[PDB]
């Protein structure tokens, strides 16, 4: 898994064209979204993650939790961003892992947001530009 | 080298704290910048690139040129983004390569922008969300 963490003043998204034949069904209210004072977690689920979705998910939850706590972000946004990596996991596994990360962070008590799965989406973000506002992490199952 | 290409309506940046002891000296006019209808090239220069800065630079110029042409972007912005990778090249090599990519794209006839080197910078971007608006590329010297 490849994660790009951007501590932002805000993040907005707008669902555009479907990127998969059968994307996540959504309502009008879910086509757009916004969150402020948030640690945006752009995530690309990789092929190697298919070996152990739960393990990789839990590792990601912990890593994202540490960063959020370190930068003082109470809000976290799980953003599907396949193009962060070149070796992607199949769609169902990406969906599974993206959901597990979201559920885990929520269960940990963070205010968490997410965007619909299976779409090309426009987005607007404002990075704080602090020393720790931009971080990358590679999380893979223990081999 | 790791490159994240985001076709955007605009990109703005604001230089914040110095990230290096001796960053690129700049004027007041260079602390901030903006470009519209642009292919933003977030670049992280990697350790392996130190083996052949010119080769990697020329490969990057070609790859970025192809994408810009494919998405119809006449404007390109070379944005230093070290945290895209985990194995970074030393600062002088990153500076060298970031400059070579900028010079090359300019010499190729594109309208090119750049941000000062050696700083933590805040930024605002708006991604178009088209199928090809988000792309990643790994460019390394021929081993
Ligand atoms: N391995 C993977 N990791 C993360 N997301 C993945 C995925 N495989 C499929 N997706 C989902 O399908 C859309 C097109 O790849 C993805 N959408 C996106 O990556 C948008 N940022 C494009 O604008 C995402 O919803
Ligand atoms: N290997 C490398 N690749 C790209 N940029 C590099 C680099 N080594 C040093 N820099 C420059 O120094 C700042 C702190 O790493 C870098 N700044 C940044 O990455 C800002 N986006 C932080 O907000 C950049 O100016």
Curated annotation (Swiss-Prot), chains A, B:
<protein>
    <recommendedName>
        <fullName>Threonine--tRNA ligase</fullName>
    </recommendedName>
</protein>
<feature type="region of interest" description="Editing domain">
    <location>
        <begin position="1"/>
        <end position="143"/>
    </location>
</feature>
<comment type="function">
    <text>Catalyzes the attachment of threonine to tRNA(Thr) in a two-step reaction: L-threonine is first activated by ATP to form Thr-AMP and then transferred to the acceptor end of tRNA(Thr). Edits incorrectly charged L-seryl-tRNA(Thr) via its editing domain. Deacylates correctly charged glycyl-tRNA(Gly), but neither glycyl-tRNA(Gly)(2'-dA76) (the terminal 2'-OH of tRNA(Thr) adenine 76 has been replaced by hydrogen) nor the 2'-fluoro tRNA derivative do so, strongly suggesting the editing function is tRNA catalyzed.</text>
</comment>
<comment type="subunit">
    <text>Homodimer.</text>
</comment>
<comment type="similarity">
    <text>Belongs to the class-II aminoacyl-tRNA synthetase family.</text>
</comment>
């Amino acid at each position: 898994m490849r994660v790009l963490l951007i501590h932002s003043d805000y993040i907005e998204y707008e669902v555009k064209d479907k990127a998969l034949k059968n994307p996540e069904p959504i309502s009008e209210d879910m086509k757009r979204g916004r969150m402020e004072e948030v640690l945006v977690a752009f995530i690309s689920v990789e092929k190697v993650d298919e070996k152990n979705p739960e393990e990789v998910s839990l590792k990601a939850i912990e890593e994202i939790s540490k960063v959020a706590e370190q930068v003082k972000a109470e809000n976290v946004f799980v953003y599907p961003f396949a193009h962060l990596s070149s070796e992607l996991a199949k769609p169902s596994v990406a969906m599974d892992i993206l959901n597990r990360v979201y559920q885990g962070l929520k269960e940990r008590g963070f205010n968490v947001g997410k965007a619909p799965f299976g779409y090309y989406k426009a987005f607007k973000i404002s990075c704080k530009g602090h020393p720790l506002a931009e971080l990358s992490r590679t999380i893979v199952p223990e081999e």
